[PDB]
UniProtKB/Swiss-Prot annotation:
Induction: Down-regulated by let-7c miRNA, which binds to the 3'-UTR transcript of RNF213. Induced by pro-inflammatory cytokines. (Microbial infection) Up-regulated in macrophages infected by M.tuberculosis.
Subcellular location: Cytoplasm, Cytosol; Lipid droplet
Effect recorded for residue 53 to L: Rare variant detected in a sporadic case of Moyamoya disease in East Asian population
Quaternary structure and interacting proteins, as annotated: Monomer. Interacts with UBE2L3/UBCH7; UBE2L3/UBCH7 is the most efficient ubiquitin-conjugating enzyme E2 for the ubiquitin ligase activity. Interacts with UBE2N/UBC13; promoting 'Lys-63'-linked ubiquitination of target proteins.
Tissue/organ expression: Widely expressed (at protein level).
Provenance organism: Homo sapiens (Human)
Residues of the whole record sequence present: 4309 to 4458 of 5207
Name of the protein this chain belongs to: E3 ubiquitin-protein ligase RNF213
Recorded family membership: Belongs to the AAA ATPase family.
Function: Atypical E3 ubiquitin ligase that can catalyze ubiquitination of both proteins and lipids, and which is involved in various processes, such as lipid metabolism, angiogenesis and cell-autonomous immunity. Acts as a key immune sensor by catalyzing ubiquitination of the lipid A moiety of bacterial lipopolysaccharide (LPS) via its RZ-type zinc-finger: restricts the proliferation of cytosolic bacteria, such as Salmonella, by generating the bacterial ubiquitin coat through the ubiquitination of LPS.
Domain notes: Composed of an N-terminal stalk, a dynein-like core comprised of two catalytically active and four inactive ATPase domains, and a C-terminal E3 module. The ATPase regions do not generate movement but rather act like an intricate molecular 'switch'. The RING-type zinc finger domain is required for the ubiquitin-protein ligase activity.
Protein backbone atom coordinates (compact mmCIF):
# COMPACT_ATOMS: atom_id res chain seq x y z
CA UNK A 1 0.00 0.00 0.00
CA UNK A 2 2.84 2.42 0.77
CA UNK A 3 3.64 3.41 -2.81
CA UNK A 4 0.02 3.84 -3.86
CA UNK A 5 -1.04 5.78 -0.76
CA UNK A 6 1.67 8.36 -1.46
CA UNK A 7 4.65 14.81 0.82
CA UNK A 8 5.05 16.12 4.35
CA UNK A 9 8.34 16.33 6.23
CA UNK A 10 9.29 16.31 9.90
CA UNK A 11 9.71 19.14 12.41
CA UNK A 12 12.47 18.30 14.87
CA UNK A 13 12.06 21.65 16.64
CA UNK A 14 9.02 19.98 18.27
CA UNK A 15 11.61 18.95 20.85
CA UNK A 16 10.66 22.25 22.47
CA UNK A 17 7.12 20.94 22.89
CA UNK A 18 3.48 21.94 22.80
CA UNK A 19 4.20 25.66 23.20
CA UNK A 20 6.32 25.69 20.05
CA UNK A 21 3.65 23.72 18.20
CA UNK A 22 0.95 26.19 19.21
CA UNK A 23 3.01 29.22 18.24
CA UNK A 24 4.03 27.63 14.94
CA UNK A 25 0.44 26.80 14.03
CA UNK A 26 -0.73 30.29 14.94
CA UNK A 27 2.02 31.88 12.85
CA UNK A 28 1.23 29.63 9.89
CA UNK A 29 -2.50 30.32 9.98
CA UNK A 30 -1.87 34.05 10.36
CA UNK A 31 0.51 34.12 7.40
CA UNK A 32 -1.86 32.13 5.20
CA UNK A 33 -4.71 34.49 6.07
CA UNK A 34 -2.25 37.42 5.82
CA UNK A 35 -3.58 38.61 9.20
CA UNK A 36 -0.80 39.24 11.76
CA UNK A 37 -3.11 39.19 14.77
CA UNK A 38 -3.25 35.61 16.02
CA UNK A 39 0.52 35.68 16.44
CA UNK A 40 0.16 38.23 19.23
CA UNK A 41 -2.55 36.17 20.92
CA UNK A 42 -0.36 33.06 20.79
CA UNK A 43 2.66 34.94 22.13
CA UNK A 44 0.55 36.24 25.01
CA UNK A 45 -0.76 32.73 25.65
CA UNK A 46 2.78 31.35 25.72
CA UNK A 47 4.35 31.05 29.16
CA UNK A 48 8.09 30.80 28.51
CA UNK A 49 10.40 33.79 29.08
CA UNK A 50 11.00 36.40 26.40
CA UNK A 51 14.22 34.87 25.05
CA UNK A 52 12.45 31.56 24.51
CA UNK A 53 9.56 33.33 22.81
CA UNK A 54 12.02 35.04 20.47
CA UNK A 55 13.80 31.78 19.68
CA UNK A 56 10.47 30.04 19.11
CA UNK A 57 9.31 32.81 16.79
CA UNK A 58 12.52 32.62 14.78
CA UNK A 59 12.23 28.84 14.47
CA UNK A 60 8.62 29.07 13.31
CA UNK A 61 9.51 31.75 10.78
CA UNK A 62 12.24 29.54 9.39
CA UNK A 63 10.29 26.30 9.34
CA UNK A 64 7.30 27.77 7.54
CA UNK A 65 8.51 30.65 5.38
CA UNK A 66 12.19 30.01 4.80
CA UNK A 67 11.60 26.36 3.98
CA UNK A 68 8.73 27.33 1.69
CA UNK A 69 11.22 29.43 -0.27
CA UNK A 70 13.30 26.32 -0.99
CA UNK A 71 10.61 24.69 -3.14
CA UNK A 72 11.40 25.06 -6.83
CA UNK A 73 7.66 25.60 -7.35
CA UNK A 74 7.40 29.39 -7.20
CA UNK A 75 3.68 29.15 -6.47
CA UNK A 76 4.53 27.77 -3.03
CA UNK A 77 6.82 30.72 -2.34
CA UNK A 78 5.35 33.30 0.05
CA UNK A 79 3.59 36.14 -1.69
CA UNK A 80 4.81 39.74 -1.26
CA UNK A 81 1.77 40.50 0.89
CA UNK A 82 2.59 37.76 3.40
CA UNK A 83 6.13 39.12 3.68
CA UNK A 84 4.80 42.64 4.18
CA UNK A 85 2.37 41.63 6.92
CA UNK A 86 4.88 39.54 8.84
CA UNK A 87 7.48 42.30 8.45
CA UNK A 88 5.14 44.86 9.97
CA UNK A 89 4.38 42.51 12.85
CA UNK A 90 8.08 41.89 13.44
CA UNK A 91 8.66 45.64 13.46
CA UNK A 92 5.99 46.13 16.11
CA UNK A 93 6.85 43.02 18.17
CA UNK A 94 8.68 44.06 21.34
CA UNK A 95 10.16 40.62 22.00
CA UNK A 96 12.08 40.99 18.72
CA UNK A 97 13.34 44.47 19.60
CA UNK A 98 17.11 43.73 19.47
CA UNK A 99 18.24 44.93 16.03
CA UNK A 100 19.94 41.60 15.32
CA UNK A 101 16.85 39.50 16.05
CA UNK A 102 14.59 41.76 13.99
CA UNK A 103 17.03 41.75 11.08
CA UNK A 104 17.40 37.97 11.22
CA UNK A 105 13.62 37.52 11.25
CA UNK A 106 13.11 39.84 8.29
CA UNK A 107 15.97 38.11 6.47
CA UNK A 108 14.15 34.81 6.99
CA UNK A 109 10.86 36.17 5.69
CA UNK A 110 12.47 37.74 2.59
CA UNK A 111 15.00 34.94 1.91
CA UNK A 112 17.96 37.30 2.46
CA UNK A 113 19.78 35.06 4.96
CA UNK A 114 23.47 34.60 4.02
CA UNK A 115 24.26 31.01 3.06
CA UNK A 116 21.19 29.67 4.88
CA UNK A 117 19.03 30.11 1.79
CA UNK A 118 21.84 20.50 3.19
CA UNK A 119 18.55 20.44 5.05
CA UNK A 120 19.80 18.98 8.31
CA UNK A 121 22.82 21.29 8.46
CA UNK A 122 20.70 24.35 7.68
CA UNK A 123 18.10 23.41 10.29
CA UNK A 124 20.73 22.86 12.95
CA UNK A 125 22.52 26.08 11.98
CA UNK A 126 19.32 28.12 12.27
CA UNK A 127 18.57 26.59 15.65
CA UNK A 128 22.08 27.50 16.78
CA UNK A 129 21.71 31.02 15.39
CA UNK A 130 18.50 31.56 17.33
CA UNK A 131 20.05 30.22 20.53
CA UNK A 132 23.14 32.39 20.11
CA UNK A 133 21.17 35.56 19.43
CA UNK A 134 18.58 35.13 22.18
CA UNK A 135 20.84 33.29 24.63
CA UNK A 136 21.78 35.69 27.43
Amino acid sequence: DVVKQQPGQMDRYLVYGDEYKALRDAVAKAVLECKPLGIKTALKACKTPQSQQSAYFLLTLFREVAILYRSHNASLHPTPEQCEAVSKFIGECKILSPPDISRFATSLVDNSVPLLRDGTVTEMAIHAAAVLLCGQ
